């Protein structure tokens, strides 16, 4: 599914 | 002190290989900051499901040689328990502005 993006 | 927190019993929040839909059912109606950890549909990965602003958010947990975490340079945690205890007192907002919550309330606490 869609996961919240957690940029580096 | 924090030693009293229910998070120290991993069974209050680790719901095993429960899927996304089951996580949504477990968290429906719960207060902000209620959370669980479970396996992801991405085989071999874990996920956090946490209530933020009345909605369930799903986050992938990465596993690197330095540990578990949500993103570099924070893939540091040697276990799920260490990750959860860290984010009980560290807001997820550092990772994404829409996640200004801690892992406050294990689903089965």
Swiss-Prot record, chain A:
PTM per Swiss-Prot/TrEMBL: N-glycosylation is important for dimerization.
Domain of life: Eukaryota
Compartments, as annotated in UniProt: Cell membrane
Tissue: Widely expressed with highest levels in lymphoid tissues. Detected in activated T-cells where expression levels are 30- to 50-fold less than CD28, the stimulatory coreceptor, on the cell surface following activation.
Positions bearing Phosphotyrosine: 3
Extra information: The therapeutic antibody Ipilimumab competes for the binding site of the endogenous ligands CD80/B7-1, CD86/B7-2 and ICOSLG.
Function: Inhibitory receptor acting as a major negative regulator of T-cell responses. The affinity of CTLA4 for its natural B7 family ligands, CD80 and CD86, is considerably stronger than the affinity of their cognate stimulatory coreceptor CD28.
Assembly behavior: Homodimer; disulfide-linked. Binds to CD80/B7-1 and CD86/B7.2. Interacts with ICOSLG.
Disease tied to this entry: Systemic lupus erythematosus: A chronic, relapsing, inflammatory, and often febrile multisystemic disorder of connective tissue, characterized principally by involvement of the skin, joints, kidneys and serosal membranes. It is of unknown etiology, but is thought to represent a failure of the regulatory mechanisms of the autoimmune system. The disease is marked by a wide range of system dysfunctions, an elevated erythrocyte sedimentation rate, and the formation of LE cells in the blood or bone marrow. Genetic variations in CTLA4 may influence susceptibility to Graves disease, an autoimmune disorder associated with overactivity of the thyroid gland and hyperthyroidism.
The name this protein goes by in its record: Cytotoxic T-lymphocyte protein 4
Organism: Homo sapiens (Human)
Gene: CTLA4
Boundaries of the shown chain within the full protein: 199 to 206 of 223
From Swiss-Prot, chain B:
Post-translational modification: Polyubiquitinated in T-cells by CBLB; which does not promote proteasomal degradation but impairs association with CD28 and CD3Z upon T-cell activation. In adipose tissue, polyubiquitinated by the BCR(KBTBD2) E3 ubiquitin ligase complex; recognized by KBTBD2 through the SH2 domains, undergoes 'Lys-48'-linked polyubiquitination leading to its degradation.
Phenotype for residue 38 to W: In SHORTS; impairs interaction between PIK3R1 and IRS1 and reduces AKT1-mediated insulin signaling
Pathology noted in the entry: Agammaglobulinemia 7, autosomal recessive: A primary immunodeficiency characterized by profoundly low or absent serum antibodies and low or absent circulating B-cells due to an early block of B-cell development. Affected individuals develop severe infections in the first years of life.
Function (record text): Binds to activated (phosphorylated) protein-Tyr kinases, through its SH2 domain, and acts as an adapter, mediating the association of the p110 catalytic unit to the plasma membrane. Necessary for the insulin-stimulated increase in glucose uptake and glycogen synthesis in insulin-sensitive tissues. Plays an important role in signaling in response to FGFR1, FGFR2, FGFR3, FGFR4, KITLG/SCF, KIT, PDGFRA and PDGFRB. Likewise, plays a role in ITGB2 signaling.
Name of the protein in question: Phosphatidylinositol 3-kinase regulatory subunit alpha
Residue span relative to the full protein: 614 to 720 of 724
Subunit structure comment from the entry: Heterodimer of a regulatory subunit PIK3R1 and a p110 catalytic subunit (PIK3CA, PIK3CB or PIK3CD). Interacts (via SH2 domains) with CCDC88A/GIV (tyrosine-phosphorylated form); the interaction enables recruitment of PIK3R1 to the EGFR receptor, enhancing PI3K activity and cell migration. Interacts (via SH2 domain) with CSF1R (tyrosine phosphorylated). Interacts with PIK3R2; the interaction is dissociated in an insulin-dependent manner. (Microbial infection) Interacts with HIV-1 Nef to activate the Nef associated p21-activated kinase (PAK). This interaction depends on the C-terminus of both proteins and leads to increased production of HIV.
Domain notes: The SH3 domain mediates the binding to CBLB, and to HIV-1 Nef.
Protein origin, superkingdom: Eukaryota
Tissue specificity of this protein: Isoform 2 is expressed in skeletal muscle and brain, and at lower levels in kidney and cardiac muscle. Isoform 2 and isoform 4 are present in skeletal muscle (at protein level).
Family statement: Belongs to the PI3K p85 subunit family.
Taxonomic source organism: Homo sapiens (Human)
Residues of the SH2 domain: 13-107
